[PDB]
């Protein structure tokens, strides 16, 4: 039922590829990054580095700021609350949409994107992968792994040195000068 | 807003790779296979044939019979109702689990699997992919694409012809003569 893996002393994901498994609600590998809880149910180890499966949940007003991925495609499927997704296409045209549970957003590689959770404890199902493989361990590497359940009581704010080195390692480029005009 | 694609007259999936998009609840490309409605939000064309994203929903008691995928890994993430997932590992050990919303099941390649919807209008989020590519257009191939919304009124029955033509073009081998020994399903128990 419980396993030890390269990522956690205690996990419900098995260390060996090829093994079927089940995980109850909430019990994937957990990470905190600012106010968000990220929960990983499958990683690249489970899929020969083809895809992953994770949830992100957070408090009202939590922002994932503008960033892009050079070799990763990313799915946003809302399961709780309401999440406003901002996207810029390759040509520079911007759009925003308030996604409610069961709605879907797709962000192709090199498209700048950001989102804001607009309800308390909103939750997004994410899959993010591409030719480059998968990068779900980005969140615990920039932020921190967590054993506790539920939202971080205090936001985990990464040290500037982490921002300097970690994001490029996981195909994340933040775009701090980006401006949204989607109104 | 809408688009004409390789798969549908009217789709909310852009035909051109590299384009961001949004789709509201229910309005992905739809397919019927027996009693179930499959709704595709992203396919291989969107991800350089890396992964896909779809939902499967259906009536109480609906069963997807035993099958396996030789190169495809499959995710079950329950969003509505309750779904019992049966899996046989590579050793032959079988397990079953009732998955409720928020719960997760994973089926590695070459593992025989089946599931049963145990509430009306249960719903699964699925990803089905692997080193060989992505699996999603299987449902409308064995079954039929659909324009209406909601569960099929009557089960769409594939012609038996399709059941050993269509399977191979996709990565699915049916196991009609598979026996479950886990209980909670017909079969001889442990
Ligand atoms: Ni992103
Ligand atoms: Ni399957």
């Amino acid at each position: 039922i419980e396993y030890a893996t390269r990522h956690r002393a205690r996990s419900f994901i098995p260390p060996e590829p090829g093994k079927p498994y089940f995980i109850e609600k909430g019990l994937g590998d957990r990470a905190h990054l600012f106010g968000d809880l990220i929960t990983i149910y499958a990683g690249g180890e489970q899929t020969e580095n083809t895809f992953n499966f994770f949830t992100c949940e957070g408090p009202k007003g939590e922002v994932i700021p503008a960033h892009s991925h050079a070799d990763t495609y990313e799915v946003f499927y809302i399961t709780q609350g309401a999440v406003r997704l901002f996207v810029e296409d390759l040509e520079g045209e911007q759009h925003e949409k308030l996604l409610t549970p069961g709605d879907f957003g797709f962000v192709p590689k090199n498209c700048v994107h950001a989102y804001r959770m607009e309800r308390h404890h909103s939750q997004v199902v994410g899959v993010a992968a591409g030719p480059g493989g998968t990068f779900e361990r980005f969140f615990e590497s920039l932020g921190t792994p967590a054993e506790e359940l539920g939202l971080p009581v205090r936001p985990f704010v990464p040290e500037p040195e982490k921002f300097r080195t970690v994001p490029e390692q996981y195909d994340v480029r933040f775009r701090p000068d980006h401006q949204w005009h989607t109104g």
Side-chain angles (χ1 to χ4, degrees), chain A residues 56-112:
Chain A
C56 296
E57 53 200 275
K60 185 177 171 65
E62 190 74 20
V63 165
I64 279 62
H67 70 277
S68 57
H69 311 288
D71 314 304
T72 308
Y73 294 81
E74 184 175 349
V75 155
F76 296 76
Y77 178 82
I78 303 323
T79 54
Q80 305 197 41
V83 176
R84 191 175 302 277
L85 179 60
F86 298 75
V87 302
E88 182 180 285
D89 65 18
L90 293 185
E91 296 179 357
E93 190 71 22
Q94 299 183 347
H95 289 105
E96 75 172 51
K97 191 146 257 246
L98 185 66
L99 304 174
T100 54
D103 295 350
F104 174 88
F106 184 77
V107 183
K109 64 173 177 181
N110 289 322
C111 289
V112 177

Side-chain angles (χ1 to χ4, degrees), chain A residues 90-159:
Chain A
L90 293 185
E91 296 179 357
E93 190 71 22
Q94 299 183 347
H95 289 105
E96 75 172 51
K97 191 146 257 246
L98 185 66
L99 304 174
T100 54
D103 295 350
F104 174 88
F106 184 77
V107 183
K109 64 173 177 181
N110 289 322
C111 289
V112 177
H113 56 289
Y115 66 88
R116 183 168 62 206
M117 294 175 179
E118 286 194 2
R119 301 288 189 281
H120 283 297
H121 218 126
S122 298
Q123 186 186 59
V124 178
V125 165
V127 177
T134 77
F135 298 102
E136 65 280 356
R137 297 293 167 174
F138 164 73
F139 302 102
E140 58 195 72
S141 296
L142 176 65
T144 184
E147 292 304 320
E148 330 91 57
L149 303 178
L151 301 179
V153 175
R154 316 199 59 206
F156 184 89
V157 180
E159 295 301 334

